[PDB]
Design a protein around this ligand. Structure first.
Ligand SMILES: CC(C)CCC[C@@H](C)[C@H]1CC[C@H]2[C@@H]3CC=C4C[C@@H](O)CC[C@]4(C)[C@H]3CC[C@]12C
Ligand SMILES: CC(C)CCC[C@@H](C)[C@H]1CC[C@H]2[C@@H]3CC=C4C[C@@H](O)CC[C@]4(C)[C@H]3CC[C@]12C
Ligand SMILES: CCCCCCCCCCCCCCCC
Ligand SMILES: CCCCCCCCCCCCCCCC
Ligand SMILES: CCCCCCCCCCCCCCCC
Ligand SMILES: CCCCCCCCCCCCCCCC
Ligand SMILES: CCCCCCCCCCCCCCCC
Ligand SMILES: CCCCCCCCCCCCCCCC
Ligand SMILES: CCCCCCCCCCCCCCCC
Ligand SMILES: CCCCCCCCCCCCCCCC
Ligand SMILES: [Cl-]
Length: 543
């Protein structure tokens, strides 16, 4: 009838938790989004707000999500019923955010698959510019300085004329690309078959190959000439850029995105932990590993960029796209200089695919588990769950088909900025921290943490939950709103008004779930307003 006793099968060993978390929040957000966002925001001044957010609101919120999941023993959509039923809309907002993120998180893997397929031939296409797709301006980067128009390198010509085939603006959708659609279908089929059945010895190889490949890339990048200028550009900050809301709104949002918080996945992962498991040290070490990985990789990219700038003769700020395609212009160029380029290119794209696939598996499984926990009778047992998973995957693929046309890069950039990024994360993080600090009780949460982990933590977590996170969120929100700046692609193309309206609607769709739930709960209860709000603030609504 109720079938509750099965509950949630706890992890077999803490190793399963460590590996699942590491594969969850260490993915493409460390090796693809961090370098290009750092490059876009001047470079060097991006680190101060980055570390300020990381040490004030990045790790405490992740630990709060994990500890809430371990405490309530419930997913990311039902745990708020046992904490604050009035503010139960946070779970729905997180579900919407992760659903919108999973749609566009796969196009990067589709591009990686296309590159890997194209790299299986004798000579790499992005090494010479005598191919058909090349324009009359392409000039080998070796001869660029010797000669002197606006010549374009073969690597960029390839990226913007074979994989992308860009169109003049979002007004023109061109025609659907079929090879990219096939790659998208292949990736989605692999993901569905992995989630459907299955999650010993290959798990020790999946979690070690990317780090070795990254170390090899770092060694090659540091060995290259001209790396000193790139490192200096990467590290030395520009204090005159901090007076712009873009730097802060990018650094804080990137910190929130890279830790996979405000998504309902960390809570679901922590829900499987034991009630007497010391998760504090493990969470701190995993956060340290994530931050260390994202920072070291940047040295490899910025040294390659400095070498490219020195070789071509142009400045370090005009050597690549400065957009969502920096990782497809920097690393493929460095692969060419290595001996036996094809082998290294294959290995690099394989590790990129693995890094993306692990995170995609984790997030999709978390979302499906939350939606199943919502309804544990109809969407459960046998054939009624696989059909639901297939329906979700098919709908996601059909929606993501919009980003593989001749003008899908603009839609991808709009999705990246507005959906699952920007102010929709700040809103949810602020509401979570404010509720936990000022309604349930930081002291009560600390008592529970001391009961379950064994020793009472320090005041850093309480202070960050109480004063440091909401202040930063509100300040960043107001600063961004007051000094409005429109979004542009490659700092040259300006979007139409309706595109900005669509992006703001995408953000508001996730943002507008808390007041709706508040109103519905208020009108679903009988009695005076004050009596209703007081009863809907009591933590133990069920049991
Ligand atoms: C909600 C789920 C089903 C997806 C929503 C349907 C939309 C977004 C999907 C379904 C069919 C897809 C279309 C199929 C064919 C074309 C032709 C091309 O000239 C423009 C892209 C376009 C138009 C695709 C874009 C995305 C598309 C319109
Ligand atoms: C009594 C409570 C549990 C009922 C919950 C249902 C209401 C509160 C929730 C459930 C999920 C929420 C929806 C999540 C997704 C969407 C799609 C978006 O395009 C419009 C908002 C909308 C429609 C949200 C509105 C409010 C919503 C429907
Ligand atoms: C704006 C500051 C960002 C970095 C600092 C975050 C919080 C630091 C800890 C707060 C508590 C101070 C005492 C901690 C050591 C005893
Ligand atoms: C981007 C819009 C759709 C994204 C997914 C939304 C589904 C989750 C919220 C609604 C599911 C529960 C509805 C019934 C609740 C009693
Ligand atoms: C815009 C992104 C959409 C991604 C796919 C939709 C995900 C959620 C749809 C199914 C919700 C089912 C709720 C429970 C129904 C019994
Ligand atoms: C008006 C000239 C033609 C424009 C063609 C539409 C381009 C793509 C717009 C749709 C992108 C978002 C899809 C829906 C997301 C919920
Ligand atoms: C790039 C460095 C990021 C480091 C983030 C974590 C620093 C906090 C110290 C963690 C040390 C190990 C755990 C000790 C017990 C709390
Ligand atoms: C089982 C304990 C937790 C597992 C993770 C431990 C990570 C320890 C810190 C390692 C930081 C290395 C950064 C290297 C970046 C390339
Ligand atoms: C003792 C008070 C601690 C902070 C209480 C919550 C602060 C919520 C935001 C208030 C405004 C912060 C600065 C915004 C500047 C635009
Ligand atoms: C922005 C988050 C907090 C918003 C709080 C107010 C939400 C709307 C409340 C209006 C209640 C109307 C129904 C009253 C029934 C007696
Ligand atoms: Cl990061």
């Amino acid at each position: 009838a109720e079938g509750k006793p099965p509950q949630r099968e706890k992890w077999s060993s803490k190793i399963d938790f460590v590996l699942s978390v590491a594969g969850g929040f260490v993915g493409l957000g460390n090796v693809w989004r961090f370098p290009y966002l750092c490059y876009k925001n001047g470079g060097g001044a991006f680190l101060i707000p980055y570390f300020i957010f990381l040490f004030g609101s990045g790790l405490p919120v992740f630990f709060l999500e994990i500890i809430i999941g371990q405490y309530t023993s419930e997913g990311g959509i039902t745990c708020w019923e046992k904490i604050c039923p009035l503010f139960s809309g946070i779970g729905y907002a997180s579900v919407v955010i992760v659903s919108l993120l999973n749609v566009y998180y796969i196009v990067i893997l589709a591009w990686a698959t296309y590159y890997l397929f194209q790299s299986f031939q004798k000579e790499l296409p992005w090494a010479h510019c005598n191919h058909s797709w090349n324009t009359p301006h392409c000039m080998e980067d070796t001869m660029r300085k010797n000669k002197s128009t606006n010549f374009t390198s073969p690597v960029i010509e390839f990226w913007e004329r074979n994989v992308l085939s860009l169109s003049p603006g979002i007004d023109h959708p061109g025609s659907l690309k079929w090879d990219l659609a096939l790659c998208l279908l292949l990736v989605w089929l692999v993901c569905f078959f992995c989630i459907w059945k299955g999650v010993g010895k290959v798990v020790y190889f999946t979690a070690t190959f990317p780090f070795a490949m990254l170390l090899v890339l770092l060694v090659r990048g540091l060995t290259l000439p001209g790396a000193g200028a790139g490192i200096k550009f990467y590290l030395y900050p520009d204090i005159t850029r901090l007076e712009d809301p873009q730097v802060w709104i990018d650094a804080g949002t990137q910190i929130f995105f890279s830790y996979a918080i405000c998504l309902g996945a960390m809570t679901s992962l922590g829900s499987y932990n034991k009630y007497k498991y010391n998760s504090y040290r493990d969470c701190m070490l995993l956060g340290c590993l994530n931050s260390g990985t994202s920072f070291v990789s940047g040295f490899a990219i910025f040294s390659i960029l400095g070498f490219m700038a020195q070789e071509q003769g142009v400045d370090i700020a005009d050597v690549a796209e400065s957009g969502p395609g920096l990782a497809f212009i920097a690393y493929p160029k460095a692969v060419t200089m290595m001996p036996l380029p094809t082998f290294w290119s294959i290995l690099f794209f394989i590790m990129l695919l693995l890094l993306g696939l692990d995170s995609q598996f984790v997030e999709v499984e978390g979302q499906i588990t939350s939606l199943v926990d919502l309804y544990p009778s109809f969407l459960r047992k046998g054939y009624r769950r696989e059909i639901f998973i297939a329906f979700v995957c098919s709908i996601s693929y059909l929606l993501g088909l919009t980003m593989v046309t001749e003008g899908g890069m603009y839609v991808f950039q709009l999705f990246d900025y507005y959906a699952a990024s920007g102010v929709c994360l700040l809103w949810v993080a602020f509401f979570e921290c404010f509720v936990i600090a000022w309604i349930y009780g930081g002291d009560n949460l600390y008592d529970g943490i001391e009961d379950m982990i064994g020793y009472r933590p320090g005041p850093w977590m309480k202070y960050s939950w109480a004063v440091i996170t909401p202040v930063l969120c509100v300040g960043c929100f107001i600063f961004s709103l007051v000094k409005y700046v429109p979004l542009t692609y490659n700092k040259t193309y300006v979007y139409p008004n309706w595109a900005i309206g669509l992006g703001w609607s995408l953000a508001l769709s996730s943002m507008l779930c808390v007041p709706l739930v508040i109103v519905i709960r208020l009108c679903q209860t009988e009695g005076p307003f004050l009596v209703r709000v007081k009863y809907l603030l009591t933590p133990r609504e069920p049991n």
